[PDB]
Scaffold this motif. Structure first.
Motif, mmCIF file in Angstrom:
data_model
loop_
_atom_site.group_PDB
_atom_site.id
_atom_site.type_symbol
_atom_site.label_atom_id
_atom_site.label_comp_id
_atom_site.label_asym_id
_atom_site.label_seq_id
_atom_site.Cartn_x
_atom_site.Cartn_y
_atom_site.Cartn_z
ATOM 1 N N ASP A 1 5.905 -12.752 -5.875
ATOM 2 C CA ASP A 1 7.071 -12.929 -5.488
ATOM 3 C C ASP A 1 8.020 -11.791 -4.994
ATOM 4 N N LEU A 2 7.330 -10.721 -4.437
ATOM 5 C CA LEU A 2 7.740 -9.277 -4.000
ATOM 6 C C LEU A 2 8.742 -8.694 -5.176
ATOM 7 N N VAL A 3 8.503 -9.095 -6.263
ATOM 8 C CA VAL A 3 9.410 -8.471 -7.537
ATOM 9 C C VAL A 3 8.635 -8.035 -8.692
ATOM 10 N N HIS A 4 7.484 -8.589 -9.124
ATOM 11 C CA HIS A 4 6.622 -8.109 -10.124
ATOM 12 C C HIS A 4 5.391 -7.960 -9.678
ATOM 13 N N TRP A 5 5.153 -6.342 -9.538
ATOM 14 C CA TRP A 5 3.854 -5.954 -9.166
ATOM 15 C C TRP A 5 3.009 -5.522 -9.976
ATOM 16 N N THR A 6 1.657 -5.570 -9.599
ATOM 17 C CA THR A 6 0.831 -5.057 -10.628
ATOM 18 C C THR A 6 -0.515 -4.417 -9.641
ATOM 19 N N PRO A 7 -1.005 -3.139 -10.061
ATOM 20 C CA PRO A 7 -1.834 -2.463 -9.236
ATOM 21 C C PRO A 7 -3.216 -3.044 -9.317
ATOM 22 N N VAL A 8 -4.124 -3.226 -8.075
ATOM 23 C CA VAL A 8 -5.274 -4.150 -8.223
ATOM 24 C C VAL A 8 -6.367 -3.335 -7.661
ATOM 25 N N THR A 9 -6.228 -2.178 -6.586
ATOM 26 C CA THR A 9 -7.455 -1.526 -6.183
ATOM 27 C C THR A 9 -6.890 -0.240 -5.610
ATOM 28 N N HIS A 10 -7.603 0.738 -5.108
ATOM 29 C CA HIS A 10 -7.211 1.875 -4.193
ATOM 30 C C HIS A 10 -8.138 1.853 -3.182
ATOM 31 N N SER A 11 -7.535 2.206 -1.996
ATOM 32 C CA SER A 11 -8.336 2.026 -0.611
ATOM 33 C C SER A 11 -9.224 3.194 -0.264
ATOM 34 N N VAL A 12 -9.021 4.319 -1.194
ATOM 35 C CA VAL A 12 -9.931 5.380 -0.828
ATOM 36 C C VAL A 12 -10.446 5.863 -2.520
ATOM 37 N N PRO A 13 -11.612 5.505 -2.748
ATOM 38 C CA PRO A 13 -11.856 5.622 -4.111
ATOM 39 C C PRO A 13 -12.172 7.092 -4.516
ATOM 40 N N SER B 1 0.882 -1.260 -0.032
ATOM 41 C CA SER B 1 -0.106 -0.168 -0.086
ATOM 42 C C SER B 1 0.785 1.268 -0.116
ATOM 43 N N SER B 2 0.672 2.277 -0.799
ATOM 44 C CA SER B 2 1.442 3.415 -0.944
ATOM 45 C C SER B 2 0.754 4.875 -0.912
ATOM 46 N N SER B 3 1.445 5.830 -0.619
ATOM 47 C CA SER B 3 0.856 7.128 -0.443
ATOM 48 C C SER B 3 0.549 8.215 -1.499
ATOM 49 N N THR B 4 -0.635 9.043 -1.357
ATOM 50 C CA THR B 4 -0.921 9.669 -2.733
ATOM 51 C C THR B 4 -1.300 11.170 -2.628
ATOM 52 N N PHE B 5 -1.132 11.646 -1.377
ATOM 53 C CA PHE B 5 -1.288 13.097 -1.150
ATOM 54 C C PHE B 5 -2.538 13.432 -1.991
ATOM 55 N N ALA B 6 -2.786 14.228 -2.772
ATOM 56 C CA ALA B 6 -4.026 15.020 -3.296
ATOM 57 C C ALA B 6 -4.612 14.165 -4.367
ATOM 58 N N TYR B 7 -3.797 13.045 -5.039
ATOM 59 C CA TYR B 7 -4.224 12.370 -6.239
ATOM 60 C C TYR B 7 -5.273 11.480 -5.693
ATOM 61 N N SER B 8 -6.565 11.401 -6.816
ATOM 62 C CA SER B 8 -7.709 10.532 -6.449
ATOM 63 C C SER B 8 -8.227 9.844 -7.601
ATOM 64 N N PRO B 9 -8.327 8.433 -7.234
ATOM 65 C CA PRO B 9 -8.523 7.602 -5.908
ATOM 66 C C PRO B 9 -7.137 7.589 -5.479
ATOM 67 N N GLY B 10 -7.221 7.579 -3.590
ATOM 68 C CA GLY B 10 -5.815 7.462 -3.132
ATOM 69 C C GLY B 10 -5.477 6.094 -2.499
ATOM 70 N N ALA B 11 -4.199 5.975 -2.077
ATOM 71 C CA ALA B 11 -3.995 4.898 -1.411
ATOM 72 C C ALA B 11 -3.936 3.567 -2.302
ATOM 73 N N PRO B 12 -3.258 3.419 -3.296
ATOM 74 C CA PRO B 12 -2.981 2.322 -4.172
ATOM 75 C C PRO B 12 -2.580 0.966 -3.364
ATOM 76 N N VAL B 13 -3.045 -0.185 -3.936
ATOM 77 C CA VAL B 13 -2.681 -1.408 -3.239
ATOM 78 C C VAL B 13 -2.020 -2.139 -4.484
ATOM 79 N N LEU B 14 -0.673 -2.611 -4.327
ATOM 80 C CA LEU B 14 -0.138 -3.416 -5.277
ATOM 81 C C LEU B 14 -0.233 -4.893 -4.934
ATOM 82 N N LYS B 15 -0.230 -5.615 -5.956
ATOM 83 C CA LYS B 15 -0.231 -7.211 -5.508
ATOM 84 C C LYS B 15 0.951 -7.830 -6.547
ATOM 85 N N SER B 16 1.526 -8.783 -5.610
ATOM 86 C CA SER B 16 2.542 -9.607 -6.405
ATOM 87 C C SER B 16 2.676 -11.154 -5.708
#
Length: 530
Positions: free
Chosen positions: A44-56, A27-42
């Motif tokens: 193997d800890l190496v190949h990551w892809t974005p799957v949702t945002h915690s604050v739509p 989970s990462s931080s997004t300041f004033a960008y909206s939707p906020g709080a992206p969640v990436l998924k992996s």
């Protein structure tokens, strides 16, 4: 089977990382960008892809809707925050403190605990669950083995709060469970229950990470510190120091440290090293043979499951279907009455002008996404036939010092322009300059307006701590993208960290005269520059 650092060359700062079964989440931080709080998924800890945002949609106050230009909520919004998955009620809990209150957003997990950590794309459903009127700055949530929830937080000293069983109230707090012995600042708490004891990771900004361990075996501490890294070299030059982030175990029991580096002007990007545990219970980073953070290491999970995402950062996006891919975020909350995703295979995004202003920083409905490094080209394909007198739409290299190539419609003339010197003042984030037309391209007829391609070639090769500014160049095609013409000077990019977020690619459309106009964004493609 090995990997090379960094694991993802995209701006994803203030990361929290954890595992559910076979899946790691970030989970990462997004300041004033909206939707906020992206969640990436992996896997193997190496190949990551974005799957949702915690604050739509950011629910932190009317300034997040950019109602009246700068300073709006620039560089406020979501700072370091925290995400954990609660097995007992199959629910993900995101906490983040924004302008003095702590907001809780939660989503069901589609029974992830029983499906090796997988969440069906259709199961995410994030809702505002609580607002706690205590500021948990740089919060780190722990859902303990007995299902009690704690939050470690603070800057420059660390406190631990215990929450009620439903996670919506504070029931107890212990102040000052840790303070640096020379009064230096610590912050960035992540909190863990590991091998029967409690640990909190904190950063000493912005060159060290400490690992704190409870001296009494209570989550309230107090905690003693050992160094995890301090001014470690590698794995990238001109990108500050690996620090902050968190630690996580793989299914086979081995532990890893996922930290991030100040790779401005691209932003802050994750690097991974293995961890080993000492006999007496402290984690240490496994360096390469010279004591540096390694440029490559063994893959953290062998034989890891495959992708299928869907859209990768570099896949063509023609805005198919009726939701945005997870790569896109607006600058501030969008006015949803002024854009439309038409959907279907044909896709296409309509952006109606949403703001009357001379100032791009004041404009609503600028749509943005991260630049992959070290060098990348971002190409927007548009139909601008719908533009009206006074409209300005285009492809922007978006940050506090910005530039764009675009179209200005004035009376019946549509003209391509390249604009630079778009600047926010770092002290207060009010607009310092609304931009300069640095070069004019051709007047474009209706046929060219129907299919204009705008290209940004960005260099985000790290330059933090150096005296060199990277440059970006801009291009347009009006022959269906077969050839491109260079327009305007090379734009020098700022290495300042103060805006926090990295440079992004964006598309905008606003009017200096009145609402009513529109453009259609037919698609976007990012190509790595090799």
């Amino acid at each position: 089977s090995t990997f090379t650092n960094p694991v993802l060359w995209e701006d994803h700062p203030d990361l929290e990382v954890f595992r559910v079964g076979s899946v790691f989440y970030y989970s990462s931080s997004t300041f004033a960008y909206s939707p906020g709080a992206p969640v990436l998924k992996s896997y193997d800890l190496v190949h990551w892809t974005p799957v949702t945002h915690s604050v739509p949609r950011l629910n932190f106050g009317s300034n997040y809707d950019l109602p009246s230009g700068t300073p709006g909520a620039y560089v406020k919004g979501i700072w370091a925050s925290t995400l954990r998955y609660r097995r007992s009620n199959d629910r993900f809990y995101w906490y983040g403190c924004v302008e003095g209150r702590t907001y809780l957003w939660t989503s069901p997990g589609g029974n992830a605990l029983a499906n090796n950590g997988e969440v069906p794309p259709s199961a995410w459903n994030w809702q505002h669950t609580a607002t706690i009127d205590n500021c948990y700055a740089d919060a780190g949530l722990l859902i303990d083995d007995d299902d009690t929830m704690y939050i470690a937080y603070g800057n420059p000293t660390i406190n631990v709060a215990q929450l009620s069983p439903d996670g919506t109230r504070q029931v107890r707090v212990q102040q000052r469970v840790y303070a640096h012995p020379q009064g230096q600042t610590v912050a960035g708490a992540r909190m863990y229950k590991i091998r029967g004891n409690y640990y909190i990771l904190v950063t000493r900004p912005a060159d060290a990470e400490y690992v704190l361990r409870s001296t009494t075996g209570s989550p309230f501490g107090p905690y003693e510190a050992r160094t995890l890294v301090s001014r470690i070299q590698g794995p990238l030059a001109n990108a500050g120091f690996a620090h902050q982030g968190g630690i996580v175990d793989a299914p086979d029991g081995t532990w890893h440290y996922v930290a991030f580096m100040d790779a401005y002007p691209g932003g802050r990007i994750p690097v991974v090293a293995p961890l080993r545990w000492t006999a007496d219970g402290w984690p240490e980073v496994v360096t390469d043979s010279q004591g540096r953070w390694g440029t490559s290491y063994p893959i953290p999970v062998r034989g890891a499951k495959n992708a299928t995402e869907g859209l990768a950062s570099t896949d063509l996006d023609e805005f198919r279907g009726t939701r945005f891919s997870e790569h896109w975020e607006w600058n501030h909350n969008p006015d949803t009455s002024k854009f439309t995703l038409l959907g279907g295979n044909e896709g296409g995004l309509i952006l109606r002008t949403a703001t009357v202003t001379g100032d791009l920083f004041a404009a609503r409905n600028t749509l943005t996404r991260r630049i992959a490094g070290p060098k990348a080209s971002g190409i927007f394909r548009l139909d601008v036939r719908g533009m009206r007198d006074g409209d300005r739409a285009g492809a922007v290299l978006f940050r506090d010092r910005a530039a764009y190539i675009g179209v200005w419609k004035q009376g019946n003339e549509a003209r391509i322009v390249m604009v630079d010197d778009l600047r926010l003042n770092e002290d207060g984030w009010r607009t310092a300059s609304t931009g300069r037309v640095a070069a004019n391209g051709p007047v474009i007829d209706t046929n060219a307006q129907q299919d204009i391609w705008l290209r940004i070639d960005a260099d985000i090769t790290p330059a933090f701590g150096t005296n060199t500014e990277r440059t970006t160049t801009f291009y347009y095609s009006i022959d269906g993208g077969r050839t491109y013409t260079r327009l305007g000077p090379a734009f020098a990019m700022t290495n300042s960290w103060r805006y926090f977020t990295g440079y992004r690619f964006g598309v905008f459309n606003f009017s200096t005269k009145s609402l009513g106009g529109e453009v259609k964004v037919k698609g976007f493609k990012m190509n790595m520059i090799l």
